[PDB]
Amino acid sequence: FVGDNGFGKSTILDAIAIVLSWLRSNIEKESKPGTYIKSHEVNNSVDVEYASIDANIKLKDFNTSILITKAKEGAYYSR
Amino acid sequence: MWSHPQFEKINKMNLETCYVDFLELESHVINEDYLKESVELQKLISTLNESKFHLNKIGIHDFKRIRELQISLEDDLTVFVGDNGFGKSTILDAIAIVLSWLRSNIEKESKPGTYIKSHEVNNSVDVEYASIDANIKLKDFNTSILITKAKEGAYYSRNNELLGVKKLASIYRLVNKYVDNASLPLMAYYSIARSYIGAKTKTVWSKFDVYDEIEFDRNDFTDFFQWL
Amino acid sequence: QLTSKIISKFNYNRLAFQLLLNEAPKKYKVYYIPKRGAGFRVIAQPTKELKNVQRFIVSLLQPKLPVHHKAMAYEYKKSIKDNALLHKDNNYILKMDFQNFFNKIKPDIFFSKLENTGLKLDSFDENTLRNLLFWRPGKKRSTTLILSVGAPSSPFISNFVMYDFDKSLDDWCRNNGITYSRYADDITFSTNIKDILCRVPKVVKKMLSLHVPGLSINESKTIFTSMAHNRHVTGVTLTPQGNLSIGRDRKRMLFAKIHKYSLGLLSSEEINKTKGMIAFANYLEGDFLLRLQKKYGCELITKFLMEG
Amino acid sequence: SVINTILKFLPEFQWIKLVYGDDDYKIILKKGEVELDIQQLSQGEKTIFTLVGDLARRLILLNPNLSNPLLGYGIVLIDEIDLHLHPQWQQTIIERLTSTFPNVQFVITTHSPQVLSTVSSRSVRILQEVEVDGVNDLIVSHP
Amino acid sequence: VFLHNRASQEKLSESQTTINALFSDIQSLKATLTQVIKGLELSLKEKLNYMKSLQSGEHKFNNAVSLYDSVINTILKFLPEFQWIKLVYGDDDYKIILKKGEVELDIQQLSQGEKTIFTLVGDLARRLILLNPNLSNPLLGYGIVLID
RNA sequence: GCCGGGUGAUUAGCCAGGCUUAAAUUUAUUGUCCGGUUUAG
Numbered sequence: 001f002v003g004d005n006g007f008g009k010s011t012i013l014d015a016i017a018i019v020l021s022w023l024r025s026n027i028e029k030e031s032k033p034g035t036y037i038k039s040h041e042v043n044n045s046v047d048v049e050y051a052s053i054d055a056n057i058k059l060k061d062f063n064t065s066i067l068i069t070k071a072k073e074g075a076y077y078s079r
Numbered sequence: 080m081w082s083h084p085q086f087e088k089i090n091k092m093n094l095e096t097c098y099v100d101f102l103e104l105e106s107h108v109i110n111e112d113y114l115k116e117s118v119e120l121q122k123l124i125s126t127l128n129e130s131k132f133h134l135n136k137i138g139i140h141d142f143k144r145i146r147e148l149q150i151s152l153e154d155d156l157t158v159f160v161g162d163n164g165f166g167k168s169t170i171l172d173a174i175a176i177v178l179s180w181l182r183s184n185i186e187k188e189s190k191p192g193t194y195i196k197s198h199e200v201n202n203s204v205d206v207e208y209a210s211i212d213a214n215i216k217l218k219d220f221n222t223s224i225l226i227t228k229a230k231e232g233a234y235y236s237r238n239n240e241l242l243g244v245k246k247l248a249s250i251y252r253l254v255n256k257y258v259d260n261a262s263l264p265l266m267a268y269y270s271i272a273r274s275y276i277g278a279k280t281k282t283v284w285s286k287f288d289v290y291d292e293i294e295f296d297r298n299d300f301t302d303f304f305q306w307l
Numbered sequence: 308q309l310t311s312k313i314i315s316k317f318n319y320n321r322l323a324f325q326l327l328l329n330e331a332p333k334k335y336k337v338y339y340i341p342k343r344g345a346g347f348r349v350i351a352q353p354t355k356e357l358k359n360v361q362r363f364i365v366s367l368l369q370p371k372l373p374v375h376h377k378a379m380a381y382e383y384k385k386s387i388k389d390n391a392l393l394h395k396d397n398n399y400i401l402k403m404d405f406q407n408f409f410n411k412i413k414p415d416i417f418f419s420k421l422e423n424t425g426l427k428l429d430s431f432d433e434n435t436l437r438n439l440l441f442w443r444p445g446k447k448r449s450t451t452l453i454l455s456v457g458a459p460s461s462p463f464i465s466n467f468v469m470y471d472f473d474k475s476l477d478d479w480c481r482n483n484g485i486t487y488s489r490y491a492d493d494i495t496f497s498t499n500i501k502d503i504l505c506r507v508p509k510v511v512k513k514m515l516s517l518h519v520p521g522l523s524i525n526e527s528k529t530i531f532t533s534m535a536h537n538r539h540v541t542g543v544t545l546t547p548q549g550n551l552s553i554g555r556d557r558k559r560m561l562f563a564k565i566h567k568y569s570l571g572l573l574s575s576e577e578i579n580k581t582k583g584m585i586a587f588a589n590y591l592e593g594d595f596l597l598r599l600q601k602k603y604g605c606e607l608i609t610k611f612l613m614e615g
Numbered sequence: 616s617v618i619n620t621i622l623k624f625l626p627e628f629q630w631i632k633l634v635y636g637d638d639d640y641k642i643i644l645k646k647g648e649v650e651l652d653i654q655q656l657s658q659g660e661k662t663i664f665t666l667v668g669d670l671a672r673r674l675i676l677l678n679p680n681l682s683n684p685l686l687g688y689g690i691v692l693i694d695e696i697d698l699h700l701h702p703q704w705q706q707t708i709i710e711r712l713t714s715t716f717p718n719v720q721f722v723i724t725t726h727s728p729q730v731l732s733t734v735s736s737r738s739v740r741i742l743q744e745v746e747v748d749g750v751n752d753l754i755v756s757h758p
Numbered sequence: 759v760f761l762h763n764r765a766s767q768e769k770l771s772e773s774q775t776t777i778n779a780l781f782s783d784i785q786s787l788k789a790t791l792t793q794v795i796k797g798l799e800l801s802l803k804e805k806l807n808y809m810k811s812l813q814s815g816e817h818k819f820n821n822a823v824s825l826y827d828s829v830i831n832t833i834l835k836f837l838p839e840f841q842w843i844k845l846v847y848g849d850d851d852y853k854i855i856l857k858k859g860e861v862e863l864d865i866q867q868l869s870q871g872e873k874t875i876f877t878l879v880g881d882l883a884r885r886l887i888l889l890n891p892n893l894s895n896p897l898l899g900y901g902i903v904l905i906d
Numbered sequence: 907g908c909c910g911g912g913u914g915a916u917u918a919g920c921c922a923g924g925c926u927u928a929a930a931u932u933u934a935u936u937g938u939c940c941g942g943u944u945u946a947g
């Protein structure tokens with residue numbers, strides 16, 4: 001990844017780090033919790049309600065997908 | 080907390096009917112300007128604003144010392160008088176317990192509140208469970224709630240009734256969605272632990288920080304200083 | 308012998324009946340129905356092939372199981388009006404109801420009660436009965452059976468089950484001058500004596516624990532009322548004079564509907580809508596049609612009645 | 616408004632100020648003719664300071680649109696209102712609490728007869744112990 | 759707890775050669791040590807201290823049971839409502855049981871009113887019984903107490 | 907005394923306009939396509 005900008009290329013790596021943590025937890029024990037998205041990481045714009053991250057893992061021809069989402073406080077709908 | 084085809088029934092001006100009418104209307108229109116300027120929203124807001132929060136009555140069965148008892152509370156001021164060991168605190172913790180589920184359901188729906196501890200049920204031989212019931216009246220709208228726990232060692236189940244609180248909380252969240260600076264009710268509890276009173280440089284303040292806990296203890300004093 | 312009669316009537320071979328016996332507790336459909344207000348309700352209903360063998364079983368078992376005479380639900384020649392006629396001349400009224408009444412009835416208590424009546428049945432009869440009248444929610448390893456509602460055989464079983472409770476509570480309430488009556492999972496008491504209705508909540512709880520284990524009282528639906536406020540019993544209002552009534556709001560509902568009909572401004576759907584309500588009100592009161600004729604005239608009412 | 620609200624319950628003080636020190640902030644009072652610090656107050660004044668300050672902060676935070684935020688709705692529960700308070704302050708705490716926040720429901724438990732001398736008869740419930748039918752139980756009686 | 763164990767072992771006997779048994783236990787501890795080290799040494803010293811019961815050997819008029827009864831009746835003097843107080847052993851632990859009316863209560867279930875009195879009186883009599891090990895009635899020493 | 911309930915009559919009529927009557931602090935109307943009750947083709 002190449003370029004300079006205010007958002008910072010580091011944050012993308014953080015997103016991947018969150019996803020892999022869930023995979024590790026389930027290996028240690030069944031249905032063990034992973035790492036959640038804290039409320040202060042959601043965007044502060046007035047037209048947002050929730051944040052999400054989508055990832056996919058390929059193993060030969062075996063495909064898996066994971067979605068992680070969190071909604072702001074006081075939202076009408078939960079995710 | 081869902082939609083309906085608005086069964087006609089008979090003419091009425093209940094808050095629930097306005098809530099259902101708005102829910103039915105919003106399922107068709109897509110433009111937000113029309114929704115934000117519709118007359119149904121104005122009716123819902125005016126009805127919610129003029130209504131006054133007021134807890135109506137409470138009943139206790141088999142909880143701590145009290146065996147069976149019902150109270151009615153005035154809308155402005157009530158005082159309990161008694162000696163030591165007469166369950167003056169028990170009523171206050173019962174009310175805090177029932178109010179915690181309403182506090183929880185406003186932050187995010189389907190979120191649990193406070194349960195009954197296993198050592199609160201009565202110590203007599205013939206008891207099997209304990210329960211608490213309450214009722215909240217918004218002028219002409221009535222809700223009720225029951226919380227119960229079975230004694231350890233028994234093999235018969237009991238559940239809770241949480242339709243009323245979930246329905247009431249959905250109205251508050253829906254109004255909060257379409258209004259910039261909508262208000263919220265105030266719930267507080269000043270226990271006997273005010274004696275204990277004697278940072279990361281927070282920069283953002285909102286109305287949802289006071290909903291972290293119903294009781295007052297420790298760091299609230301610290302935050303008061305930072306706020307001042 | 309019950310399996311033989313079912314086989315003879317429906318012409319079932321050994322293999323087909325064995326398969327039906329094995330797969331019976333899973334032929335149910337779960338769906339939602341809207342609520343008057345806001346919310347939803349959940350129902351479960353069996354298939355067509357199981358319903359008409361449940362009705363046959365009920366018709367076979369009806370003349371052999373006693374039922375108390377104070378239960379006015381799902382009974383022949385009984386209705387709401389006969390329920391309300393008991394409390395029509397008393398002052399103070401108290402109402403209570405249970406908590407998840409239907410799904411607290413299990414085959415253990417059904418067979419326990421059935422053994423006490425003196426009716427002896429073989430192992431085959433017990434096996435066929437257990438696998439035919441009960442529902443199994445959850446996975447195939449649940450091994451839990453409940454009655455549910457929406458099945459033609461549940462109401463009779465529940466009425467037969469609550470016989471002892473009805474009998475024991477009846478003679479306790481009679482000795483203290485209190486009237487008592489039960490409709491499905493609703494119980495009502497009424498009397499004229501002051502400060503006597505504050506003692507029954509502990510009595511009913513003791514009776515429930517003694518005579519039918521498992522059941523319990525929903526404590527958030529207990530009501531006390533007198534002649535100074537609104538009084539009604541299962542949907543019919545009691546005027547202070549002591550007469551049954553439908554309510555002033557519905558009377559003006561119908562008077563306005565008919566007046567708007569006289570101008571020919573009513574859709575065809577509302578005619579069939581209002582005709583049933585008018586018939587029900589006439590049955591409940593007994594003089595609604597006379598008042599309508601005395602106000603709008605027989606020619607218009609007769610034309611409206613014969614319409615459609 | 617916050618400062619005067621706090622000063623409403625402590626008539627013996629003159630003003631409250633916030634003074635920036637070299638490395639820290641300080642709250643300075645003035646009692647009589649001597650300036651005081653928040654750590655040099657008695658237990659009673661500390662209790663009143665914390666109670667009123669917390670109530671005002673909660674009300675202001677919850678009602679931003681109102682011109683006067685002290686008129687919100689809600690319910691407040693207090694246990695043993697007469698902690699660390701002399702009888703002179705015991706007689707007037709109730710009417711000041713009710714006058715400052717007029718649209719808030721209050722539930723209060725007390726222990727002493729001094730407060731009972733200044734409450735209407737329609738808002739008093741008295742607990743008692745009575746053995747009925749061989750079982751001891753608690754009852755509530757209106758005056 | 760310690761005063762109760764001493765009361766049971768000393769006055770109510772049921773201990774036989776307690777000193778010899780404690781010495782044998784210390785000998786077994788030494789044999790195990792020959793066969794965490796600091797903890798084992800501390801336990802061995804504790805066993806020797808227990809074996810020193812014969813060295814102490816007082817069993818005087820102010821025995822353990824007399825002190826236990828004096829403490830219990832002293833506490834019960836300030837709480838007229840209650841009936842009796844006991845120390846119950848169960849689930850490999852000790853707990854305090856109080857009787858009020860017809861219901862037995864633990865210590866967690868009391869109100870603040872009797873919690874304050876029980877704590878203050880218990881600590882005051884603890885210090886009086888502990889700092890005057892020679893008086894016939896230990897609640898007769900001298901001192902100064904400040905209460906706010 | 908006051909307030910809150912019951913309702914025959916009244917009105918291009920589900921609002922309103924009148925006359926009666928009731929009282930311990932003390933109801934805020936409910937689930938269909940199943941079951942039984944009412945009417946009808």
Ligand SMILES: Nc1ncnc2c1ncn2[C@@H]1O[C@H](COP(=O)(O)OP(=O)(O)OP(=O)(O)O)[C@@H](O)[C@H]1O
Pocket residue numbers: 143144162163164165166167168169170198199200201202203694695858861863867868869870871
């Ligand atoms: N499980 C229980 N079974 C029976 N009685 C209990 C139980 N738990 C508590 N109690 C009773 O509760 C009483 C104290 O209750 P509570 O603390 O509500 O009263 P209070 O002294 O008026 O309160 P406070 O001083 O905390 O304001 C004790 O005297 C005890 O007998």
